[PDB]
Amino acid sequence: SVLKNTSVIDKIESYVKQYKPVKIDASKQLQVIESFEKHAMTNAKETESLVSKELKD
C-alpha cells in the first residue's frame, strides 16, 4: 500500500503465488544408505563378538 503507482506488485505477487511449490524434498536415498548401515552392522557385530570372546578368554 505504501507504493502508489506500482503496476508491478501484482505481477510479482502472482509470480510468487504461482511458484509457491518451488520444489519437493529429495528423499532419493533408500538403499545405498541402507547398504552403508548393513556394512556398519556387520562390522559392529563381528567386532563385539571378537571383543566378548577375547575378554572371556
Binding site: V8, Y15, Y19, V22, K23, K28, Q29, Q31, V32, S35
Partner: protein, 89 residues
Amino acid sequence: QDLYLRELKDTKLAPSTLQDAEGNVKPWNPPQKPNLPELELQGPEALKAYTEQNVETAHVAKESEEGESEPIEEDWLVLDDAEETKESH
C-alpha cells in the same frame, strides 16, 4: 487578499497543464508525458539489472548428489582404508 488569491491561482494554473490537465508541460519545453511515466519507468530497471532481476529468475534447485548407489566398492574401500590406519593407532 490580492496578495493571496492571484499567487494561488498562478501556482495552480502553472502545474495545471503539468499535473491536472493533460496539456503536456508549458513552463519548460521538454516533454514530461513520455519521460517520467515512460522513459523513467524503466529507470529502476535501468539502474538495476533489466530483464534479469525484475523478472526474479527462479533456478530450480539442483538435485543433491550422494554416493551414487555404490554399495560394494565404497564400503570395501572404506573398510580397507580403516584397516590400513588401524595398525598405527
